[PDB]
Amino acid sequence: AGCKNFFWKTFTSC
Amino acid sequence: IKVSKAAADLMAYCEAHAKEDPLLTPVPASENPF
Amino acid sequence: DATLSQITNNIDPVGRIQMRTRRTLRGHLAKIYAMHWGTDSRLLVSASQDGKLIIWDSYTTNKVHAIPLRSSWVMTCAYAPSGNYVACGGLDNICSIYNLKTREGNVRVSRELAGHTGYLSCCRFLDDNQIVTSSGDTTCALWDIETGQQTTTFTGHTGDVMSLSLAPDTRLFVSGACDASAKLWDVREGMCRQTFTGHESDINAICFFPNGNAFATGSDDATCRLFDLRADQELMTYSHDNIICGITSVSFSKSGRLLLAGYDDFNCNVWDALKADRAGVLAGHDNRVSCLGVTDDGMAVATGSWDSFLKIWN
Amino acid sequence: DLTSNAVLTFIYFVVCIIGLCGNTLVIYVILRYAKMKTITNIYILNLAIADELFMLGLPFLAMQVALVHWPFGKAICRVVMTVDGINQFTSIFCLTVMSIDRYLAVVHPIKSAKWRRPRTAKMITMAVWGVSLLVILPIMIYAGLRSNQWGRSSCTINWPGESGAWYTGFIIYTFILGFLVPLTIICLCYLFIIIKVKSSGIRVGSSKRKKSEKKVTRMVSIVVAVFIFCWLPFYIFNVSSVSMAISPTPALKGMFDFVVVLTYANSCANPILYAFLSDNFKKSF
Amino acid sequence: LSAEDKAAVERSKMIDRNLREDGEKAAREVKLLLLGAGESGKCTIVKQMKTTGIVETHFTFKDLHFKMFDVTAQRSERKKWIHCFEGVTAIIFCVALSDYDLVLAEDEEMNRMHASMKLFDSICNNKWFTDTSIILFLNKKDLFEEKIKKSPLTICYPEYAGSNTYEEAAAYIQCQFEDLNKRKDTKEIYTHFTCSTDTKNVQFVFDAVTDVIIKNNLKDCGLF
């Protein structure tokens, strides 16, 4: 999981 | 030799011999090999 | 007292000639200079600065023969009417003739003509034995392939000879030089019969009318002049305000209606040859055209420029 | 936060249309006006095709930054992330092989006559597309969807197992062979060119190496500058995000989206830089 | 699919590959064209080569194949065949420095340096050699020193005024031949003083061609 804020190009919220 | 006679000779030969492609192009796209 | 342009008002002027690139020809890597059409109207020979005389057919668009030339600075090439021999005149004053139909697959040098003192401008084939070669030493020479030595010499031009053309009967033939003069010569008599001094610039191209009593000359001042062998007088001229460059290629149709003319403005023109009007314009070449040859039967027209690209127009 | 995503979608669109018209212009002059026999011609052509496909996937990323919801799907996201991934590595590798080709042509003008060739350049481009597909293996086999409590859904690369191991492992994988190695190769190749030009100038004694070296040094300077300005801030932002947890901030989202447009602008300006400022290309156009 | 003429097509692709290989080998080698004002002393470049209107002398030096072409035997006008040497790697203009007081055997009023400068002005102001560079060599250096030791040099150039020496007259005539062309940005003039050394002349030629083939690659890639 992890739920990273910014990893490569996307905005993934938790 | 008159110049008008040579001019009439050139016009007569050009009008008699007219079975050529670039002038009228009467052949279809299948007759010519190109 | 009566000109040709003033009597051609009865016949209507021909419209725009629609000639497109039917079969593009690539493979060359150097600028093409001269070409020649065979009697079969199928095979054509081209010469480029890479030292490779390539002969191929315009129908299937594939190479047939490629002869490596000894002198890469070749300026002209001709095709025999029978199709057995092929000659090319390089800057080394050597008219290398190569035999195509041989026993082995490789091409063998048939003969070399190194009797001239000036650069070979262009050459033409009379038959399998005799051949006329035009050089840059203000003279023309009729050579024999079987003999190998110069047989006839014509010294009547006061300037560098650049152009040469033959007639169907292979009896009369006119030649143009840099002295703005076109002269008629014979293959058997051996002396100048008629001369024409109507031009005023460097004549670089010439062509013979299929009738046999006239011919056209192209100079470097963006104009052409149609002369005749009967009356000895300029019949008409072709000059437009658009063309300003020289003329290095002049050809005729199957009968002599569409006067082909190659300029240095990256395109080709087609004149009506009767009313002095550009009937069609053929563009598509990157660099200036160098050679322009029409088949004997008037099937197609081949154009070769300095962009190493041969284009066929129908 | 509405005007922030509005101006972001605006700058995402204007950089896309200038990329479509810009790259199509380069392709038009290369295929029609220019010839395909020159080694550097097909190099810019392959770079223009890679830039074209990179700009085609941009509206998909532009729609993702406009609204948080991703109503496209799963399989459509898998292919566009591969396209965006395969085009980024190809454009980076194209700049590397182009700097190497320029390095071989300047430093070794005698050996380059037999080293590079039109058939060899085709094998190099084929190898570039080959290694680009090899470095995007985790991107294809680890792509998925992520759901939120508010009903939103975001498509990103998911790594199974314990966190903090595959994330930092992949962020250094793309940093070395995508940023570190390509930049040092381009920098070393451009540096050797300057030394080769300077050495050839002082040996011939023509006293004309002043304007020649100044133009090449300026060309190398602006190339490295736009490369650093659009790749260095974007990479350090990713490493700092995966190393330490950062709080969500709209300013961070705008800054992250800003450096992405710069990366797309660099891929947009790279084909037009090698074409417009070139001598042979400007003569043909 | 072209089964009746498959052998003809296969032979066409085979000879086309040989044409591409020959064109590739032609790009690997170097072609040099040398000119002169009839009697300039171009024979000194023949001894530097390792080794009939035109002749071709080929030689390999430092893993590079050079091809020098002499067109001095062409008695015809140059304006009709000067365009045949487009795309050459380098151009050479041989000229003897000591040929400044002798009068050309044309009209008893034309200086050898005036005819050499006129020919250099003609081969420079042409639409054919706009991209090629000229690498001219000053022949008869030792003879020019012995001739300038008892000559004021004011007979050839009336506007020239300076000390009667070699270090200044050679530099003056060098700048005179450099600022004669108009394309000072595309074309590059390389002046070289030839001495009684063969390994030095062939070294400058290799270094000059190397600078030319480098500057050509910068123009193709877009650096220059």
Author numbering:
A (entry chain L): 1 to 14
B (entry chain C): 28 to 61
C (entry chain B): 27 to 340
D (entry chain R): 39 to 323
E (entry chain A): 5 to 55, 182 to 354
The authors write:
In contrast, the Gi1-coupled SSTR2 and SSTR4 adopt full active states with a remarkable outward displacement of helix VI (~10 Å, measured by Cα of 6.29) accompanied by transverse movement of helix V and inward movement of helix VII, which are consistent with activation characteristics of class A GPCRs. Compared to the SST-14–SSTR4–Gi1, the SST-14–SSTR2–Gi1 complex shows that the C-terminus of α5 helix of Gαi1 tilts ~2 Å toward helix VI (measured by the Cα of F354 of Gαi1), which further induces an outward movement of helix VI but inward movement of ICL3 of SSTR2 as opposed to SSTR4. S244ICL3 of SSTR2 makes polar interactions with the side chain of E318 of Gαi1; however, W247ICL3, its counterpart in SSTR4, pushes the ICL3 away due to a bulky side chain. The closer contacts lead to a larger interaction area between SSTR2 and Gαi1 (~1129 Å2) than that between SSTR4 and Gαi1 (~965 Å2), thereby contributing to a stronger binding of Gαi1 towards SSTR2. For SST-14, it adopts a disulfide-stabilized β hairpin structure with the key pharmacophore (F7–W8–K9–T10) at the tip of the turn. In SSTR2, the protonated nitrogen atom of K9 forms a salt bridge with D1223.32 and a hydrogen bond with Q1263.36, which function as anchors at the bottom of the binding pocket. The alkyl chain of K9 is also involved in the hydrophobic core formed by F2726.51, V2987.39 and Y3027.43 and the indole group of W8 interacts with F2085.38, T2125.42, F2726.51 and N2766.55. F7 is encompassed by the hydrophobic pocket formed by ECL2 and helix V, including I195ECL2, W197ECL2, Y2055.35 and F2085.38, and T10 is anchored by hydrogen bonds with Q1022.63 and T194ECL2.
